[PDB]
Amino acid sequence: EDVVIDRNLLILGKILGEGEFGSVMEGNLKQEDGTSLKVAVKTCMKDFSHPNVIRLLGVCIEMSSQGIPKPMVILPFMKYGDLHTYLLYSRLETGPKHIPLQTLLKFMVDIALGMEYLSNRNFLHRDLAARNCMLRDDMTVCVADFPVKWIAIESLRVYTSKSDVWAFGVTMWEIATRGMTPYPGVQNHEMYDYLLHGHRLKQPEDCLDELYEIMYSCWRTDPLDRPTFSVLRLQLEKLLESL
Ligand SMILES: CCCCNc1ncc(-c2ccccn2)c(N[C@H]2CC[C@H](O)CC2)n1
Ligand SMILES: [Cl-]
Ligand SMILES: [Cl-]
Ligand SMILES: [Cl-]
Ligand SMILES: [Cl-]
Ligand SMILES: [Mg+2]
Incomplete structure (x- = not known):
């Protein structure tokens, strides 16, 4: 839960590639310091911390029109x-x-x-x-x-x-x-x-x-x-x- 982010800080764009459970979208993450960060969104890792291991920037759970959940893992670009x-x-x-x-x-x-x-x-x-x-x-x-x-x-x-x-x-x-x-x-x-x-x-x-x-x-x-x-x-x- 400490990993979750409010979706309103997230903006999705083009598709970068195709992933396992869905497509990977480029996006902008509005950081705590107010700035915007280019990220990758895929549409256990937070405990990892190593320069040669991908970091997790957070997670978003956008709700759909029908209410079916759409989880999203925020990763670096x-x-x-x-x-x-x-x-x-x-x-x-x-x-x-x-x-x-x-x-x-x-x-x-x-x-x-x-x-x-x-x-x-x-x-x-x-x-x-x-x-x-x-x-x-x-x-x-x-x-x-x-x-x-x-x-x-x-x-x-x-x-x-x-x-x-x-x-x-x-x-x-x-x-x-x-x-x-x-x-x-x-x-x-x-x-x-x-x-x-x-x-x-x-x-x-x-x-x-x-x-x-x-x-x-x-x-x-x-x-x-x-x-x-x-x-x-x-x-x-x-x-x-x-x-
Ligand atoms: C491991 C993926 C982490 C997401 N970060 C990222 N950033 C840029 C690109 C990127 C950079 C240049 C061109 C296209 N994508 C990219 N491509 C993904 C790689 C894995 C694949 O399964 C899906 C696309 N991922
Ligand atoms: Cl969006
Ligand atoms: Cl290249
Ligand atoms: Cl061979
Ligand atoms: Cl990384
Ligand atoms: Mg892959």
């Missing part, structure tokens, strides 16, 4: 949008400049730092992917939105933090390939058999051997054999310093 679509733009003219290797690692580290936070609070993401990572105006990444080619083999139906590491591994692959779909040539219904027979995501063309080892360690068959987010973050931070 990020002009650079989801990270998946950003990777695709970068390899085109007009879009963002060619993303260097170092910057790509900074994305991975940010995500790693964000998952380290949620994993310390023993919170499972259950849907980590490059599409669910947003780029702030300072080009830092934050996790949000908490599908077969991202799910861990053991979960194909048990889920732990080590499954988030699996998804994190795939996300690293998405980033290193600048927006490729996982498992080219393989179809969704073949994934369990494909993984069960020991096959994993192949190494990208220009990717570093020591960067592939890190993301490969995310797909070890035994979840307990996989590294924690704290180990992963430091490995990426150290690989980044060696450039």
